[PDB]
Amino acid sequence: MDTTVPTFSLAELQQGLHQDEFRRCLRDKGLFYLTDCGLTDTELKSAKDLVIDFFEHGSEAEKRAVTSPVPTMRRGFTGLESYSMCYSMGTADNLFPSGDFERIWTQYFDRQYTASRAVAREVLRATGTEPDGGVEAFLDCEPLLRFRYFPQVPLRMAPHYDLSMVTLIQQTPCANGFVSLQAEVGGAFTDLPYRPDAVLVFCGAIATLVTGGQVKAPRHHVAAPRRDQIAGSSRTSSVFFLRPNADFTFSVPLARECGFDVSLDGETATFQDWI
Numbered sequence: 001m002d003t004t005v006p007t008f009s010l011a012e013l014q015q016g017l018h019q020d021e022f023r024r025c026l027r028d029k030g031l032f033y034l035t036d037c038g039l040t041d042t043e044l045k046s047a048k049d050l051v052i053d054f055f056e057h058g059s060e061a062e063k064r065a066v067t068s069p070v071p072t073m074r075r076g077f078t079g080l081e082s083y084s085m086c087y088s089m090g091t092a093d094n095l096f097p098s099g100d101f102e103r104i105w106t107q108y109f110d111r112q113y114t115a116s117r118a119v120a121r122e123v124l125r126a127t128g129t130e131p132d133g134g135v136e137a138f139l140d141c142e143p144l145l146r147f148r149y150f151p152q153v154p155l156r157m158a159p160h161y162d163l164s165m166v167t168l169i170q171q172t173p174c175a176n177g178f179v180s181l182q183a184e185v186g187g188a189f190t191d192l193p194y195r196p197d198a199v200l201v202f203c204g205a206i207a208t209l210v211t212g213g214q215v216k217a218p219r220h221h222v223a224a225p226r227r228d229q230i231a232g233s234s235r236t237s238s239v240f241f242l243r244p245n246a247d248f249t250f251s252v253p254l255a256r257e258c259g260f261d262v263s264l265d266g267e268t269a270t271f272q273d274w275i
């Protein structure tokens, strides 16, 4: 039936405006684009620009000394060695190629994090939800950002819900129109392109959980291009996962009620256990 994906100014929402629509969008299709939340395509494009700079012009040497040590616990670069390169950050223990990089990308992270907190904060106020220990404690959490860059100019994974409170995507488009990102919206698969001055927001499982089921975490997937769509497909994505502190808590009879792969037992549980 209904597949459209709505847009909102965060400033306007904070001014009480559009209350019902925003409420229903959460509960029935857990996603949306978002203007006026103190992110800018310029900031994004300046960050992108210096990573690709390093991709292209760094020695074997500087890379090695800041490529991922533990390959799966996640800080630094991957997939740059002689299809997808990828940079990761967090609150700390980060790895940086130069001094100026550190600044630009530390600020880029902060701005992201602040925005993430804001929208999240709004998501709670809107469901009249007030987490155990406080809205702020909860929002002071252990977040993670992953940037991807697909350069140069066929297996199909299954959709997933994100293991997050909210997730913010900023993407750059392909020179040829192809959208990698799609989601289940009222029965169907809707494209999720780059929109100018906007930023995409998935609600995540944690959102659903903390609001006592009031908010939907949409299943989404990231397609590759068919072996004929390859020319003009360089793209990037900036994906900021707003993950809680290890010790957040949730009643497991509530959890499975929304179709969540949890092979653990007992009374309630915690975020650390689950990942």
Ligand SMILES: CC1=C(C(=O)O)N2C(=O)[C@@H](NC(=O)CCC[C@@H](N)C(=O)O)[C@H]2SC1
Residues within 6 Å of the ligand: 146, 148, 222, 237, 239
């Ligand atoms: C959303 C998203 C993206 C992405 O590039 O956008 N990718 C990342 O940053 C990724 N994170 C990982 O590599 C873990 C893989 C998750 C899943 N395959 C599993 O272990 O059972 C993926 S999965 C999450």
Ligand SMILES: [Fe+3]
Residues within 6 Å of the ligand: 161, 162, 220
């Ligand atoms: Fe995802």
